[PDB]
Amino acid sequence: SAGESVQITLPKNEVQLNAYVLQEPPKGETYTYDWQLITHPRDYSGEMEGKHSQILKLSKLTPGLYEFKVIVEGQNAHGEGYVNVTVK
Amino acid sequence: SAGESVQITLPKNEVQLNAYVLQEPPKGETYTYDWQLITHPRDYSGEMEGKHSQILKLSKLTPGLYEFKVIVEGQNAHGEGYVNVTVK
Amino acid sequence: DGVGNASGDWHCDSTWMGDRVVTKSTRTWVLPSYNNHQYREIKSGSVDGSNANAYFGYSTPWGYFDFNRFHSHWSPRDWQRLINNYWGFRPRSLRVKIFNIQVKEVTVQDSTTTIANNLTSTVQVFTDDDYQLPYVVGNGTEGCLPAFPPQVFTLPQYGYATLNRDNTENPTERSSFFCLEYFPSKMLRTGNNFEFTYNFEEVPFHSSFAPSQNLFKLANPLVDQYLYRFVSTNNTGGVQFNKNLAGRYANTYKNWFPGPMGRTQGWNLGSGVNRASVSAFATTNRMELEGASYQVPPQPNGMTNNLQGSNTYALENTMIFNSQPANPGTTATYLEGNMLITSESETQPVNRVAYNVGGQMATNNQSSTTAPATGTYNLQEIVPGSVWMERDVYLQGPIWAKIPETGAHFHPSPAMGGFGLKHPPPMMLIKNTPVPGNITSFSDVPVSSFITQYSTGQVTVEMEWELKKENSKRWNPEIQYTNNYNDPQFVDFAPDSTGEYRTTRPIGTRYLTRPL
Amino acid sequence: DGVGNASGDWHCDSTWMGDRVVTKSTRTWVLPSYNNHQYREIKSGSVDGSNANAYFGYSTPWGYFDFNRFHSHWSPRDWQRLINNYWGFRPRSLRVKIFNIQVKEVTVQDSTTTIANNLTSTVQVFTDDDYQLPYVVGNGTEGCLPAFPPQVFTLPQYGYATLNRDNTENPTERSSFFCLEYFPSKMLRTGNNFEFTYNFEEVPFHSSFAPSQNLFKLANPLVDQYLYRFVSTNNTGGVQFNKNLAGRYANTYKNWFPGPMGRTQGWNLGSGVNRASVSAFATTNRMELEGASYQVPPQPNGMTNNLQGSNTYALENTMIFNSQPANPGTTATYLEGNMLITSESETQPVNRVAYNVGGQMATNNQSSTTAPATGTYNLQEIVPGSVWMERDVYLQGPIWAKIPETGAHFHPSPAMGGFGLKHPPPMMLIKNTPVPGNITSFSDVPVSSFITQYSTGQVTVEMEWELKKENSKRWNPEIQYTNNYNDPQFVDFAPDSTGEYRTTRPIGTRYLTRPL
């Protein structure tokens, strides 16, 4: 698996995250991505839009560490990536 | 199965052992070798590196008899070899 | 008894009956078969550039029940009812019950992984009542009954470190091995249950009140002292005195002294600049033991890590919890926004501030030729007529610790808070009895192929606590723990939209006050 | 009783109560269905160039419990507590229990091999209390309860040899067949259990002490004897005497003699050159029986295989164990580094050395014309006023042996050590009751297709031992068995990193001393 870490600051917070998997399949075969927020600041109320898509949209991000875990699977091919976001 | 027996002496002890199986498959099919130490001297503390590989590395061998058992399997083909080491 | 009859019932409750309160908790646990039924000798060398990290020990195939966290017995609301009304409390008894056991066999033939239940399998259970095994329960480790009652938890694996030789991974001739199958245990099939009771030894009440007076200013501000003080020498060297006036606390004679202190470094949370790009470790407080250097949070009792209305924290004199539970072995870099940083600011009237010097004293001998000189100190231990407050207990924190058997100790009160016990609630160990796979021939070599399986069941803990009734004559209203949030986006101490339990703040225990 | 209720509990323990000690052991066993439910007549001709190897007998489909090894009842540490403090011990009673049985059916349809449990199947169990069957237990064979409690073991298959004719594979008209289904047995389903008690017959205490004096030097070294001795003849042939002086032990008159000895060959372990490229067999000590030549280790009691502080061992007078358990039928050539070679050097003050001549004696009649001549001997049996020490018991060795019923024996103490019993703990046999496959038509020919299955369960053995308290007046400190290792890489008598139990040394029984 991977471990791509991103960072942001200032008042702006709403951000979107895509998903990149190795061994890309044919057009006829699309995967069903799945995002799981495993760690977030204690204040974070926020929401998650388009989890099952390639891009998860985040809004209302309070300062702290955010831990995600996108899981990409298909026909005889399970997988997943990891991503950390740090807000100041 | 086979029964290849090796021997060593003097202070030197660290040795490596490969694995040879009959009916070698295609490059696209690699086996997952497995080594098991079934007999060793009562003093032997040592370690085993790269068991699941073709070559098992041994270090800190005290005098005595060592019994190994490499097992090589694949797609519809289970197998295994035996090897004895004697240190003086 | 039998397969179609339940071995116990669900009890969650709190019964307040004057001077006592009885809490009951039931949870559902799951137990994996650890190590595949065998003992292993585990060990480590020097990790992260520190040989204090080296060890030698054993993992076992047993798991254990750990209920040494307050939130395992108290709901947020009963905790609030306790800290807003009582001056103290202490544990009196304990009753534990394991019931409704279910062993499941797991078979993964042809990637189908089917789970069936095995009606004839057993789990073994015993309590170490004579404290013959390494007690690992009161050391701030995970795996306790969860805070929230609907949560299902995995029991942790029992393991222990024994002696390693010279800060390396090797054992010494004194390192011991403890085989847990060498104790008598009960075996339980799906219709069986295990029950166990315990009484705590008389311990002092925890003090859940804050001091309403400062220790150095106990004299009446209206009357002068009948004691005098040296204030200077005249142009000839003769000594002069002055009477200690009314309310001049900087000079009065004192009877009592603040507790022991060892200076810790202070860092600013939120607003407040700190030194940039620092690496704590290299400059943290350490204690040497057997040739190695160990960090010692939270430092010994008797200090305050924060000064009320300030954002400077002596971080290593602090208990830092996470707002949520984490995965095993995470190496993520959490920020202040993710933590539940505790503050002991309500002990400041009696406990010295950890990031400040502790005082000063004479360094020389004055004479006609030398002027009196003084020098500050960074650490000061116990002196006679010393008083301090022990660390507070939090809802998300530990209830007790075992006092180590050595024959010599001073004031057995654990650094992390809670009760220090000579004989604490015994460890309860549990494991899935092994079931051999298909074995067709004889061998003197021990069986190594087992049917894979796991168990699950319910566990009920019932604790009786004794309370110390608050008896104040304060006139004006007191501070109380209260549910105060400005524009809540979610209810705190409740499940959110996802179903995960939220907790945004550590709840200590000192809201009520008392005059010294 | 029932499927969802456990039939017994786990007990492992040691309870020392003065003059007694009670050990309890529980293990998990697995039982294969042997022979596919049938008796077979097994036999062999002359193997390895020796017709002493020929036999004729029967294998049965039964397995048995064997707990005739000390390590099945004693932990390394309790063994140490016994040999450092007592002068002797002997077994008093035995209690056995088989419980928590589980029969599993195995089906291999389409290479899926699924294991399900069969709730209605039985195991049969009985104890041969009248010793009507060939007793195979005390003959140094494998399959005993394991040393380490978490280990799971396979029960061995019962078999026996009867009489063969003329050192060939053929039976004689006296060869007997014993059908074990011809005894009354209990049948146990998954809710049942079997229990059995036994009392040992009064036996002599084992002697767990070493002699503090040499048998030939019991006279006071300060006083002379009032006895004289022939020392020579003068130039005329007249005999001359000399008084036996004080401390000249080479000449004193003796009252007692060392035990019997039969010279064995001595070999050097470690440092110490031996004859190169030898083949032991051809020159080992043998005894003839029925026309065949058998090796007879460890030789009869009364000798010492090693001389303290020497590396020469009379290897065939020695008990040689392996540091670990081996697979069935291994033909590997082990070296000294793999073995646990025992030494009886602490009996040397009383037992003759096995690799040396036993003494000498007169071969002729001297006269004016012939000089007295003498000749050494290699074997010498019992004489009156003979004393020796029996072989020692080891933790990894055998507890008892059955004394063969023949009506005539001398000093029934087994060569391998332990107690010799007229009526030893009866054999406990067990087997999976056969369950027929799908049979659709009638036949007078016996059913031969069965459902394949195996069983497993727990077994608890409880033994009471009587101790003989050490009562010494020695002033200086004694030798004790102690955990002494220079730079341990692992803890001995503990599981290693792999989970396999290690044991690097045989632990005998004589540490304490006594004056003769």
With 0-12 / 13-18 / 19 or more C-beta atoms within 10 angstroms meaning exposed / middle / buried, residue C9 is: exposed
Whether the CB-CB separation of D318 and D341 falls below 8 Å is answered with yes
C15 contacts chain A (CB < 8 A):
no
Find chain D residues with C-beta within 8 A of C130's C-beta: none
Classify D163 as helix, strand or coil.
Answer: coil
Phi, psi of B87, rounded to the nearest 5 degrees: -105, 135
Q: At residue C208, what is the residue type?
A: S
* Touch between A and C (at least 3 CB pairs under 8 Å): yes
Residue of A13, A44, A47, A66 best to disrupt the C interface, most CBs of C under 10 A: A44
User: How many C-beta atoms lie closer than 10 Å to residue D99's C-beta?
Assistant: 21
Q: Are B45 and D336 in contact (CB < 8 Å)? A: no
**Cβ neighbourhood burial of D289 (10 Å; 0-12, 13-18, 19+):** exposed
Tokens representing C168 are 């390396």
Q: Does C28 touch chain D (CB under 8 A)?
A: no
Dihedral angle computed from the Cα positions of residues C292, C298, C304 and C309, in that order, rounded to the nearest 10 degrees: 120
Reduced to 3 states (helix: H, G, I; strand: E, B; else coil), residue D461 is strand
Contacts of C493 in chain A (CB under 8 A): none
SS3 category, D127: strand
Handedness of CA D100, D105, D108, D112 (dihedral sign): negative
- Helix, strand or coil, per DSSP, at residue C307: coil
Residue D267 near residue D313, CB atoms below 8 Å: yes
Q: What is the CA radius of gyration of chain A?
A: 14
Residues of chain B by 3-state class (helix, strand, coil), percent to 5: 0, 40, 60
- Give the SS3 label for residue C96: strand
In chain C, what residues touch D454 (CB-CB under 8 Å)?
Answer: 436, 438-440
Residue contact D4–C179, C-beta within 8 A? no
- Cβ contacts of residue B83 below 8 Å, gap of 6+? B3, B4, B5, B6, B17, B67, B68, B69, B70
> CB-CB: which of D8, D10, D488 is closest to C171?
D488
What amino acid is encoded at D353 in this protein? V
**Burial of D91 per CB tally in 10 Å (0-12, 13-18, 19+):** buried
Residue D278: CB partners within 8 Å, gap ≥ 6?
Answer: none
As a whole number of angstroms, the distance between CA A10 and CA A40 comes to: 18
CB contacts < 8 A, A to C, total 44
If you write DSSP's letter for every residue of C36-83 in order, what string do you get?
GS--EEEEE--BTTBGGG-EEEEEEEEEEEB--SGGGT--HHHHHHHH
Q: Is the peptide bond before D298 cis (omega within 30 degrees of 0)?
A: yes
Q: Residue C204 corresponds to which amino acid?
A: P
Suggest the residue from D273, D335, D496 to mutate for an interface test with chain B (most B CBs closer than 10 A): D335
Q: How far, in Å, CA of C370 to CA of B51, rounded?
A: 77
* Best of C36, C108, C125, C182 to mutate (most D CBs within 10 Å, chain D): C182
Tokens of C181: 């199958």
C-alpha dihedral (C282, C286, C288, C294), degrees to nearest 10: -70
Establish whether chain D is in contact with chain A, requiring a minimum of 3 CB pairs below 8 angstroms.
no
Deposited resolution, Å: 2.5
**Residue with structure tokens 């062993």?**
C103
Non-local (6+) Cβ contacts of D508 within 8 A are D83, D342, D343, D346, D392, D393, D394
Instruction: Tell me whether residues B43 and D326 touch, CB distance under 8 A.
Output: no
D260: closest CA of chain C, how far (Å): 36
Token pair recorded at residue D126: 């009985």
Amino acid at C406: T
Subunit contact B45:D490, Cβ cutoff 8 A: yes
How far D43 CA sits from the closest chain B CA (Å)? 27
- Numbers of helices and strands, H then E, in chain C: 1, 34
Enumerate the residues of chain C whose CB falls inside 8 A of the CB of residue A67. Answer: 332
d(CA C414, CA C429) in angstroms, rounded, equals 24
CA distances from D213 to A8, D219, D308, D512 (A): 88, 11, 15, 13
Which of 400-439 (C) contact D at CB < 8 A? 433-439
Distance between CA atoms of residues A58 and A63, nearest Å: 13
Q: State how far the Cα of A51 lies from the Cα of C38, in Å rounded to an integer.
A: 42
According to DSSP, the residues that pair with D40 across neighbouring strands are D59
**Residue D262: what residue type?**
G
Q: Is the distance from CB of C401 to CB of C393 less than 8 angstroms?
A: no
Q: Which residues of B touch D (CB under 8 A)?
A: 38-43, 45, 62-65, 67, 84, 86-87
Report residue C243 as tokens. Answer: 């009477």
Does D485 touch chain B if contact means CB atoms closer than 8 Å?
A: no
Q: Where are the beta strands (DSSP E) in C319-373?
A: 320-322, 339-341, 352-353, 359-362
Q: Residues C382-385: contacts with CB within 8 Å, 24+ apart?
A: C382/C259, C382/C260, C382/C410, C383/C257, C385/C255, C385/C256, C385/C257
C touches which chains (3+ CB pairs under 8 A)?
A, D
Encoding tokens for residue D423? 């009526």
Residues of A in contact with C335 (CB under 8 A): 41, 63-65, 86
Q: How was this structure determined?
A: cryo-EM
Contact of C336 with chain A, judged by CB distance below 8 Å, is answered with: yes
Domain coordinates in residue numbering, chain C: 1-516
A70 within 8 A of A81, measured Cβ to Cβ = yes
Query: D337 and B42: CB-CB below 8 Å?
Result: yes
- Nearest-CA neighbor of C438 among B36, D112, D99? D112
